[PDB]
Curated annotation (Swiss-Prot), chains A, B:
One Pfam assignment: Lactamase_B_2
SUPFAM superfamilies in UniProt: Metallo-hydrolase/oxidoreductase
Signal peptide: none
General function of this protein: May be involved in the transport of PQQ or its precursor to the periplasm.
Name of the protein in question: Coenzyme PQQ synthesis protein B
Residue spans crossing the bilayer: none
GO biological process assignments: pyrroloquinoline quinone biosynthetic process
Transport in keyword set: yes
CDD domains per the UniProt record, alphabetical: PQQB-like_MBL-fold
Source organism per UniProt: Pseudomonas putida (strain ATCC 47054 / DSM 6125 / CFBP 8728 / NCIMB 11950 / KT2440)
Amino acid sequence: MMYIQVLGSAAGGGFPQWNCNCVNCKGYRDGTLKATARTQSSIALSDDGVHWILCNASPDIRAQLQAFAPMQPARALRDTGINAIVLLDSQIDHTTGLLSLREGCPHQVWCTDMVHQDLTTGFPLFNMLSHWNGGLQWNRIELEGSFVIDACPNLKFTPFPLRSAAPPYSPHRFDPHPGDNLGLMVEDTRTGGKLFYAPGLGQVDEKLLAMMHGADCLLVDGTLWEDDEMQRRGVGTRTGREMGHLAQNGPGGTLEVLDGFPRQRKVLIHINNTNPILDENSPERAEVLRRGVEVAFDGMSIELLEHH
Amino acid sequence: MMYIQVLGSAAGGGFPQWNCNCVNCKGYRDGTLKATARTQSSIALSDDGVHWILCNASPDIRAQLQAFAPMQPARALRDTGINAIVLLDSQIDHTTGLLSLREGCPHQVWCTDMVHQDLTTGFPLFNMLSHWNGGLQWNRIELEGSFVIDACPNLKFTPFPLRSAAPPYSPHRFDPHPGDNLGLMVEDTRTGGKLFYAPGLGQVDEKLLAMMHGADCLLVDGTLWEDDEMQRRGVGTRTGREMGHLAQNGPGGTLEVLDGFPRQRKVLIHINNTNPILDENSPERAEVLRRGVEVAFDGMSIELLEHH
Ligand SMILES: [Zn+2]
Ligand SMILES: [Zn+2]
Ligand SMILES: [Zn+2]
Ligand SMILES: [Zn+2]
């Protein structure tokens, strides 16, 4: 059994976003909209429900941990369910949470060389946290092969490279390198059950579709419904392509991509506050569910039992 | 009228603390203890209830803003009640919140030279955030005199130096300098009403007591009940003196110090998860209230009407 817990299901900024008054955010606050608040994207993985691997440490980590009981096993006066942390990129909304874990150092942190570079220079979390009882102990994620974290020895992680898009603070933001971003394939080696986790997906190719067809659950980028969604809401100018996010709708959208995966479980995650699928009464929500695709929410539990 | 909003009232780690199972934290989670959850220390100030000055940006800032309606005036599709931010030190639990405000840059940030140094080197928030639409615009807090933030032109801030204790990440942590920590005197220049804000107070002297007697509301360090409180709970070794916090109890404690201030309003803030005054049925809580001292809580509103 592979346990997948959705701690946070929103894109950066959360839902509602602190400074946003778009139709969703303002409608939520006014109570005129049927939607559920969401923290910034993070999931927890486990092969026993007791030892947990964190994927991305969101700025909302304190509320996310508190909301999920297994994160506090209470086996001693100081204790936690986090046995390791995996970073998919060096972005601020995926790493800031580590600062809130300073009281429980050391932590094993798995990330690529490029991400380790960013996090020892432009956002030197490793340098900062090292003053707290050994800080973060780096474990290198290689750009080939797989890795196993001893706390969950039945989980086999196979990372795959995504289009390099280093954070704006990154010394090499204008110089993208392989290792800047990745998606995860996670396999329960006892059953064969595979999770495909790609919260940040800007493009698909043949190699990608091939490994998706080998997976049992598809947990993918659901940031924007339309590529110019920020313009439509009137709260920004950046497109989904500029942000490295494939929209759900239109030709080449994820919904069209997901049509070739009828047998896989399909869940949209990392959803922006502007996305209509957050409105549970939207025709966009209805279309998603009509296509057999789920919309992730904070507290969602995905059980991965076996392999197709 | 001076409005003071308590966004967060706990010391670092919050209450409950993510990794802590002391009598308070575990008792809260079990529901066997009568206590209220608290986010990490931060207050908001205003002279009109519309424009707000943030003091310290806690890691819990997203939940703190969402919980206080004036933080979202909803005057445009993107908007906020934060018009300026004041930092009292460069500690992680007082500055991390700034990262969560990247979507609404630029922000005016007021802090001392020493704090600006830390935040451009060991924790280079200013360097990181500058890639977000102008980032943080530094306004120097001088170690003498006062300053006025134009958004709240009736609020006069007079900072006062506290014992220098630079954060562990700080290049000059072993070399403390004046400007590392300060407390605030805030005056409504229309009424004369003064707030004394010293969330981090490790020692008192004659100069300190003299300016406290000139204030109307005393909002001070309430981290530990006892100096060896971390040892008593069994969750650490550090003392309140090692942490730069004066305990409430015993000779020289804050309660004894506050006895010489019968006319002032007295509120304890920045309270550690281990502190018995969090237990609303504790004899420690009872003693505090018996001495005319209040225990701050998340969402507390303090109205400063006039001067004694
Ligand atoms: Zn994100
Ligand atoms: Zn919005
Ligand atoms: Zn603090
Ligand atoms: Zn505790």
